[PDB]
Each structure stands twice: as structure tokens, then as C-alpha cells.
Design a protein around this ligand. Structure first.
Ligand SMILES: *[C@@H]1O[C@@H](C)[C@@H](O)[C@@H](O[C@@H]2O[C@H](CO)[C@@H](O)[C@H](O)[C@H]2O)[C@@H]1O
Ligand SMILES: [Cl-]
Ligand SMILES: [Mg+2]
Ligand code: NA
Length: 257
């Protein structure tokens, strides 16, 4: 049989994959005046913690660089993620081509290897000017991610943004105003874009677990008259009953004395 119990279910777990375009087309001046402030305001708005939002961060250009792994100290502690941004401001100058497909493939690899948290919202934030090394290859992997229930938000950065491609990879529809998947203003707009993707929702549900079969009833405690016997079973779940006692009779006892 089965056991029923109540529990509260929220969507507080979010695995957030921040993919940052560091290619030459972004440009150094844009890196400093636009990209770094965008990353700061974005990350400053995120409530990181072990049990809630976990940050992953990748820098893509000629190559890809995994900067922050899911679950690490820098992944779950806001101040530490911000220090990584500071390191990028001070020591990284954009150069090279744009390995956008490879960065998105890192997210695929997480899902494939089951590195993500099973119950977590999967959210990719892609910051780019929208000029990848291969247009179709980038669209293809983004599409595969969406098919696996990954949410994708695109933030436009860089001196020369291709809004057509950014909107395309974000899944914006032609003729529709206010695409909910693409922002190209400041960090405030980007934060407001991200908000509905990660808003907390708590509901009260009823849960069910299979307790498994019982072992056979034991013999009666007495060999005549009234007694008790029991049956047991392994605990296949915390809520499951494992022992059970009942009455039993073995005819009548003799009259003596
Ligand atoms: C099991 O076999 C039965 C045939 C009886 O002989 C049982 O003994 C009876 O046990 C009860 C207690 O359960 C006593 O009150 C009686 O005095 C005794 O005859 C036996 O255990
Ligand atoms: Cl690419
Ligand atoms: Mg580029
Ligand atoms: Na990675």
C-alpha cells in the first residue's frame, strides 16, 4: 500500500548560467562602460545561496573559460561572484572571435552529466552583441536547450549589436511588442527581464509514497486462547509504518485445578 502526507513545494532553486561574450567585437570601451556595470547590477540583484540561486559563469571569445562552477563558494556567495567581476574589469580585455555555440554547449553538458539540480529552474542569461562564429550552430544549441525546459534570456551588449540575431535566438516573435526574452538597455531593465523567470512560487501539495508489502504475520503469541501477533516490513520511506500488531485466537484453553 501507500502513505500520504502534506508538504510545501517552492521553486526556490535556480541554476543560473551566465554566459558572457568577451570577443573582440564587444570592444574594450564597451567592456568598461557597459558590460562590467551590467554584470555588477545583475549579480547584485541575485539572491545567491546554497539552497536557492546558484550561479555558473562562462566567458566566451576565441576560446571559452569556465569562471564559476555551480555550487562553489563563488557560485552561492554574492560578494565572491562580484569579486570575479572585479577581476574581469581589471585584467580582461576583449579580443578574438565568438565561441557562442561552445558556451551554450557547456550548459548542455551540465544537463547531460546531471550536474544541475534536478528540481532547479534552469535559466541561461546570454550576454552578447549577437555575432557568433556560426549563426546556425548557435541557434541550434539554444533551441535544443529550450526543448529540455531551459529558459533563455538574452542581454544585448557591445558597441555594434545585431538585434535581429539576438531577438531570433531569444525567440522573439516578429510584429509582437515587448519581447519578454530580450533586453538591450541598462542593468535595471535586465533585472526586470529576469524577474518573472525566477519569481518564487510556494504551494501546498499532497505527496504519496509506496510503503511496500508486509512480511507474513507471525504465529500467535499463545498456543491456546487469546493472544497477539504482528507483521513487519522494511522502511522504504520515512513516513511509512513498518510494524503492526493485531489480536489472534488459538481455540480455547483447558480448564485446570
Ligand atoms: C501451547 O500449546 C497449548 C496446547 C497449551 O498447552 C499452551 O499451554 C497453556 O498456555 C496458557 C498460556 O498461554 C496457560 O494459561 C495454560 O496453563 C497452558 O496450559 C501451550 O503454551
Ligand atoms: Cl558559435
Ligand atoms: Mg564577436
Ligand atoms: Na563549463
Amino acid at each position: 500500500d501507500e502513505v500520504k502526507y502534506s508538504e510545501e513545494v517552492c521553486n526556490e532553486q535556480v541554476d543560473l548560467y551566465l554566459l558572457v561574450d568577451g570577443s573582440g567585437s564587444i570592444g574594450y570601451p564597451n567592456w568598461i562602460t557597459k558590460v562590467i556595470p551590467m554584470l555588477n547590477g545583475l549579480i547584485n540583484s541575485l539572491s545567491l545561496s546554497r539552497d536557492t540561486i546558484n550561479l555558473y559563469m562562462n566567458l566566451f571569445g576565441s576560446y571559452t573559460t569556465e569562471l564559476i562552477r555551480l555550487g562553489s563558494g563563488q557560485s552561492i556567495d554574492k560578494r565572491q561572484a562580484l569579486s570575479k567581476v572585479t577581476e574581469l574589469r581589471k585584467t580582461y580585455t576583449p579580443y578574438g572571435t565568438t565561441s557562442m555555440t561552445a558556451a551554450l554547449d557547456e550548459v548542455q553538458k551540465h544537463l547531460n552529466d546531471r550536474v544541475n539540480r534536478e528540481k532547479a529552474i534552469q535559466l541561461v542569461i546570454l550576454m552578447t552583441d549577437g555575432v557568433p562564429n556560426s549563426k546556425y550552430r548557435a541557434l541550434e544549441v539554444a533551441n535544443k536547450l529550450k526543448q529540455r525546459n531551459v529558459r533563455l534570456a538574452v542581454i544585448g551588449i557591445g558597441q555594434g549589436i545585431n538585434h535581429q540575431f539576438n531577438r531570433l535566438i531569444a525567440g522573439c516573435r516578429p510584429r509582437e511588442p515587448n519581447c519578454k526574452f530580450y533586453s538591450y538597455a541598462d542593468w535595471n531593465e535586465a533585472v526586470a527581464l529576469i524577474k518573472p523567470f525566477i519569481a518564487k512560487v510556494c504551494t501546498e501539495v499532497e505527496r504519496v509514497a509506496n510503503c511496500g508489502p508486509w512480511d507474513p504475520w507471525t504465529a500467535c503469541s499463545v498456543t491456546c486462547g487469546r493472544g497477539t501477533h504482528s507483521r513487519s516490513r522494511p522502511s522504504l520511506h520515512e513516513k511509512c509504518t513498518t510494524h503492526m500488531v493485531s489480536e489472534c485466537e488459538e481455540g480455547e484453553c483447558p480448564h485446570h485445578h
